[PDB]
Write a protein that binds this ligand. Structure first.
Ligand SMILES: Nc1nc2c(ncn2[C@@H]2O[C@H](COP(=O)(O)OP(=O)(O)NP(=O)(O)O)[C@@H](O)[C@H]2O)c(=O)[nH]1
Ligand SMILES: Nc1nc2c(ncn2[C@@H]2O[C@H](COP(=O)(O)OP(=O)(O)NP(=O)(O)O)[C@@H](O)[C@H]2O)c(=O)[nH]1
Ligand SMILES: [Mg+2]
Ligand SMILES: [Mg+2]
Ligand SMILES: [Mg+2]
Ligand SMILES: [Mg+2]
Ligand SMILES: [Mg+2]
Ligand SMILES: [Mg+2]
Ligand SMILES: [Mg+2]
Ligand SMILES: [Mg+2]
Ligand SMILES: [Mg+2]
Ligand SMILES: [Mg+2]
Ligand SMILES: [Mg+2]
Ligand SMILES: [Mg+2]
Ligand SMILES: [Mg+2]
Ligand SMILES: [Mg+2]
Ligand SMILES: [Mg+2]
Ligand SMILES: [Mg+2]
Ligand SMILES: [Mg+2]
Ligand SMILES: [Mg+2]
Ligand SMILES: [Zn+2]
Lengths: 95, 115, 37, 321, 311
RNA sequence: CCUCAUUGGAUCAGGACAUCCCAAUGGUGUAGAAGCUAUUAAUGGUUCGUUUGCAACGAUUAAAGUCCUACGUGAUCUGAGUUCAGACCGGAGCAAUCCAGGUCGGUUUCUAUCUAUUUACGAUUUCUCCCAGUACGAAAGGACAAGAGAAAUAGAGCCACCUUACAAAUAAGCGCUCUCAACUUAAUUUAUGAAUAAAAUCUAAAUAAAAUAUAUACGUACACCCUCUAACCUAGAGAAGGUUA
RNA sequence: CUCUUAUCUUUAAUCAGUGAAAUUGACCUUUCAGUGAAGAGGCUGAAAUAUAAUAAUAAGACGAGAAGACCCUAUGGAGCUUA
């Protein structure tokens, strides 16, 4: 995507309201030729993600944002602390 | 192609998979009307006595031209609510997952490398 | 519309008709009162 | 939300003489906790309210023991209070995984003992979800409570022009900018006393018991309401309100409550509002201990003036306890 | 050291073969000729397993509980066990070791006295006292036939005694046990339950050997030993398996046990470049041997149901 | 005084409707959403496993219907059982033997004479998107029709790619493509209007309409009278059929 | 096994030579409903219908075979045991 957007929300209710408002405005605001966008994560109760053609928005609760740390990964593409801990291995026989 | 009783490689950093255990995970169910599982198709694993949902992110069977064939059947674990269990994926993931009908944006966010 | 063997009126407003080869009691006030033979 | 249910325990199977042995205990009714949504299903779906259990199988040749009967179950809303037909509280399914032996299956028929068969117990059991609102509205007739609920929410409340109106309380959840929803229910105007269940009575007053807090509307016009000839002042009305509430239940008086002045729009009402300020707080010309919570705000429902101010006070008290 | 064994997501232990169903029918039909019913069980598990149907279906006749395998169990609080079992409504309970004929004499006098209180109706004239033994698999139910067969009649083994569950399949004919009271026994196949209660009880019920271990895997069960063995304080596996020091991780202990026993497999692992077959230590074999030592009593005496009995 | 002994599976399925899903409707203690009950309809469909010897569960699905065809079907195949020759325990009998008690072992073959049969069709279901987080509803929650797009399965075909073979010019699927119209009705709902003074009444009155599943009216396919030494063929068992500067 | 596929040999098929077996009341040997003892190519009533081959399937002819099973009978046998 061209732009990656992450925004926290007060509660689950607030999260649903923000997602619905953006989609409603998106359809109203032109995009007549452009196709439609799904709302993903409704089954999820704390993290909702909407992927527009050139932008992706992830709305999640504070604790979910803290655990996943999406900001760090995309800011630091290959130097994320969690990524660093993931090493590589091989498979030798045991003797 | 993943079926019932296939052996799978968890490609997350989640403890459920990451931890070395003498038995690999085996597929118990493929969520399709077709029994076969391809890229982007969910499956139910039996991993360490636990039944856990997962998503296929690559397989050894050939696909259509211009798509990547992997050497192992790769899978990511997703929670019941649909949020990924693990927080990082360092293995390349095909970009076809974006346009397949379904919810894959959460997994794509967690994946740094795309092929 | 219940298909019963005997048709009996249940209220004053109920009335009877012979449509499509069968007897009906049709009540406008209370649709519960509808019966077909 | 205060429905009733009848049940019947299974009968005990009769035994087989000459060493055939016992008969199976009749089936018993166990109300089983499930998703709270079941209350709508119970009252409406499966309208027949009789829950009966299979009687135990009679002892058969070869001295087969009884099947022990077939049990029956009632899915119920979480938080339901199980009470007898007489009103005695058998139990409450406050938490999940809370089954209750509401009815007793017929004692297993045993030929060796005194009784060959025995019939199952059957009873009427009240299962009720009396409105557990966050706060409740208690006021005398013509107070204005329905009008107050009308504007805070969009509930189209029945407006009680005369007494003994709006018998069923109307539940309304109040939305807030914080996305917090507070449920408020307005019951009908209550009569003085009512400890003997006069008129409207205290039967609906059980609904307030469930409510965490109490909301008191104070119609300024009610002050010196001639009626037949009580001519109750608002000062008197509050004293009667406190007294009658104590008689019905001591705990009700102790429960957190708030005060809502009404009908202040009229200039004379504003003069009375100063009289309302005078009444209570500092001692006046009294005509037992009583409680004044002091969460009193001056508003007029008809003009919709000061309504926003009261909303805040309510939420503060709620968030506190 | 861990705090609580993870039981989220694990399933219950469903075994219930067909013979445990056809059998249950024959047992019901045999009520005609049974004066008393004896429930055998594993002393290590006082309050679990315990197929409820036995009290339900076989409740017609008087009942007696015989907790077997007392030798490989901790019975310091035996007094406490009786107190609660009295509350359960099991006034008479017996602890017996079949292999070394411990306390097996007492059973017959109690059955005699117990029968005297009851009525016999149709069988009031028969002089032979026929009683019936039931219980879950591998509780010594078949052995109890032989231990009494010899203790009183001094004749010899008459019922096939085997380690693995399922040896005795159908309800058999009577087996003579004594001559003076002329007591016969009816042997029946072990039945567990159509539905065990909890994932833990089912996990415990596999420890003593009541259900085939492969239905549980033998890997979600070896872990349970280490938990309870360490929790209960019986740090005996370290000495027996010459481990470095106490531990609470299966991958570690089973790594040590496997090396000690010089057991390895050729196991296919799936790496990122394709399947590869790599020789590895037998984690599966160690789990079995670790289980088979526990069950043999060389790892110590245990009270799997603890803090449930005291209360 | 006691008692007790044909049926699973595989393959291929024909049919009933007393309908499990799909479709059209009446009633409601049907606000919406979920449900309940009844009418109509036989259209196509109606999953994969574990322990099992009958059930007992797991994960799914729009649904995992109930029955009849001599377990529908062993000259198509297969496991039990009936049930034996050997052998053990348990229980009988002085023994031989025996038990409608356990268990382990344990050979049915068939070249089809007759009938019958072996060369097209016009599609089902599910999810997502939109309408629209709207109508409704105090909130919670949350539709219908209309409209667009994806797959799954079935049917009919094909080989540019991919894959697997022949270490051949081919054949396959694990690859690719294509699938539609309804003249004719049932439950039910309307309009006009007599018997019957109505400013009534859908009508086994004369009338006008709408409305499941079915189906063949209506289409597509076929259609030519055909030389043959022989060779060749993406046609074929033979014969037939195609091709021949 | 999902879910089958390709190749080669055997057999098959066509040409030449040689040439059996069980089986067979007679047959100019059809479908549906009925009747009947669980039962019909052959009976009752409808219907269908130029004639002969070749290669295939196995629903039927309660298809063909063996010294197969099961119960009962005989003032038929025989082996075994005894009290
Ligand atoms: N002047 C004035 N009139 C008011 C005010 N609030 C309500 N009313 C009037 O009071 C009239 C009587 O009905 P009202 O008391 O509102 O109904 P209610 O609240 O349901 N009464 P009850 O207490 O019996 O349930 C209403 O018709 C309304 O016009 C107010 O603030 N000022
Ligand atoms: N240590 C010990 N082992 C015992 C004891 N009784 C029986 N066993 C063991 O348990 C096994 C025999 O079980 P068995 O007597 O057949 O009991 P069962 O319950 O009748 N068997 P089943 O599982 O078939 O129902 C053997 O491994 C035997 O050594 C005992 O008192 N102590
Ligand atoms: Mg069919
Ligand atoms: Mg029908
Ligand atoms: Mg046949
Ligand atoms: Mg043949
Ligand atoms: Mg012999
Ligand atoms: Mg065998
Ligand atoms: Mg052999
Ligand atoms: Mg045999
Ligand atoms: Mg032929
Ligand atoms: Mg639509
Ligand atoms: Mg020849
Ligand atoms: Mg002819
Ligand atoms: Mg016929
Ligand atoms: Mg004829
Ligand atoms: Mg020939
Ligand atoms: Mg034939
Ligand atoms: Mg004779
Ligand atoms: Mg003779
Ligand atoms: Zn009526």
């Amino acid at each position: 995507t061209d732009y990656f957007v992450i925004g926290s929300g007060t509660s689950t209710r607030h999260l649903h309201a923000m997602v619905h408002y953006l989609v409603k405005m998106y359809k109203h605001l032109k995009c007549r030729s452009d196709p439609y966008v799904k709302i993903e994560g409704k089954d999820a109760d704390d993290w909702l993600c909407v992927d527009f053609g050139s932008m992706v928005i992830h709305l999640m609760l504070p604790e979910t944002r803290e655990t996943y740390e999406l900001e760090k990964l995309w800011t630091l593409r290959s130097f994320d602390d969690q990524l660093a801990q993931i090493a590589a291995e091989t498979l030798p026989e045991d003797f | 192609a993943v079926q019932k009783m296939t052996r799978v490689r968890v490609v997350d950093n989640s403890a459920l998979g990451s931890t070395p255990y003498h038995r690999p995970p085996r597929c118990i169910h493929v969520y399709n009307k077709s029994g076969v599982g391809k890229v982007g198709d969910q499956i139910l694993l039996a991993i360490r006595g636990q039944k856990k949902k997962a998503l296929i992110v690559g397989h050894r069977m050939p696909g259509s031209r211009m798509t990547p064939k992997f050497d192992s059947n790769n899978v990511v674990l997703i929670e019941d609510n649909g949020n990924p269990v693990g927080t990082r994926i360092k293995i390349p993931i095909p970009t076809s997952l974006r346009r397949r009908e379904g919810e894959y944006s959460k997994v794509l966010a967690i994946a740094q490398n795309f092929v | 519309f219940k298909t019963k063997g005997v048709i009996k009126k249940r209220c004053k407003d109920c009335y009877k008709v012979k449509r499509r080869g069968r007897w009906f009691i049709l009540c406008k006030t209370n649709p519960k009162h509808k019966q077909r033979q | 939300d205060n429905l009733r249910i009848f049940t019947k325990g299974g009968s005990g199977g009769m035994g087989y003489p000459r060493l055939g042995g016992e008969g199976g205990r009749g089936g018993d009714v166990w109300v089983v906790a499930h998703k709270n949504m079941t209350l709508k299903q119970l009252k409406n779906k499966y309208p027949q309210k009789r829950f009966v259990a299979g009687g135990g199988a009679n002892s058969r040749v070869s001295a087969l023991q009884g099947s022990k009967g077939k049990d029956c179950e009632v899915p119920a809303p979480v938080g339901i209070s199980v009470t007898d037909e007489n009103g005695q509280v058998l139990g409450e399914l406050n938490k999940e995984e809370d089954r209750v032996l509401v009815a007793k299956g017929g004692l297993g028929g045993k030929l060796h003992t005194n009784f060959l068969p025995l019939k199952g117990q059957k009873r009427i059991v009240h299962l009720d979800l009396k409105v557990i609102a966050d706060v409740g509205l208690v006021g005398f007739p013509n107070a204005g409570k329905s009008s107050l609920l009308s504007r805070v929410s969009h509930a189209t409340p029945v407006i009680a022009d005369y007494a003994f109106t709006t018998l069923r309380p109307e539940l309304g959840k109040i939305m807030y900018n914080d996305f917090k929803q507070i449920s408020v229910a307005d019951l009908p105007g209550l009569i003085e006393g009512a400890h003997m269940n006069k008129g409207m009575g205290h039967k609906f007053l059980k609904h307030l018991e469930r409510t965490r807090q109490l909301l008191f509307v104070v119609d300024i016009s009610g002050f010196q309401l001639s009626s037949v000839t009580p001519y109750r002042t608002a000062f008197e009305t509050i004293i009667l309100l406190t007294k009658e509430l104590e008689l019905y239940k001591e705990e009700l008086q102790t429960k957190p409550a708030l005060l809502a002045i009404n009908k202040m729009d009229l200039p004379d009402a504003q003069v009375k509002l100063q009289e309302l300020m005078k009444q209570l707080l500092s001692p006046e010309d009294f005509l037992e201990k009583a409680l004044e919570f002091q969460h009193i705000v001056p508003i007029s429902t008809v003009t919709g003036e000061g309504i926003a101010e009261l909303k805040s006070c309510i939420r503060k008290a709620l968030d506190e306890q | 050291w861990r705090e609580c064994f993870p039981l989220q997501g694990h399933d219950v232990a469903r075994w219930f073969p067909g013979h445990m169903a056809k059998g249950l029918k024959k047992m019901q039909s045999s009520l005609k000729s049974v004066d008393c019913v004896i429930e055998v069980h594993d002393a290590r598990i006082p309050f679990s397993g315990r197929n409820p149907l036995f009290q339900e279906l076989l409740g017609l006749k008087p009942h007696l509980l015989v907790l077997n395998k007392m030798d490989l169990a901790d019975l310091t609080e035996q007094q406490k066990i009786v107190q609660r079992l009295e509350e359960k409504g099991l006034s008479n309970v017996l602890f017996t070791n079949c292999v070394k004929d411990e306390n097996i004499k007492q059973i017959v006098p109690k059955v005699m006295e117990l029968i005297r209180c009851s009525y016999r109706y149709h069988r009031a004239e028969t002089p032979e006292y026929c009683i019936m033994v039931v219980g879950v698999p591998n509780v010594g139910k078949s052995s109890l036939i032989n231990s009494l067969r010899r203790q009183h009649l001094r004749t010899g083994k008459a019922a096939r005694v085997g380690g693995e569950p399922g040896i005795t399949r159908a309800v058999t004919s009577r087996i003579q046990v004594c001559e003076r009271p002329l007591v016969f026994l009816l042997d029946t196949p072990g039945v567990l339950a159509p539905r065990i209660e909890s994932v833990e009880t089912g996990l415990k019920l596999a420890l003593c050997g009541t259900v085939l271990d492969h239905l549980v895997g033998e890997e979600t069960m070896a872990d349970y030993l280490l938990y309870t063995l360490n929790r209960h304080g019986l740090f005996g596996y370290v000495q027996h398996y010459a481990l470095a020091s106490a531990c609470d991780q299966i991958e570690w202990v089973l790594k040590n046990v496997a090396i000690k026993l010089r057991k390895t497999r050729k196991v296919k692992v799936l790496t990122g470049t394709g399947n590869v077959n790599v020789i590895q230590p037998d984690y599966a074999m160690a789990a079995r041997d670790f289980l088979r030592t526990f069950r043999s009593g060389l790892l110590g005496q245990v009270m799997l149901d603890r803090d449930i009995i005291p209360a």
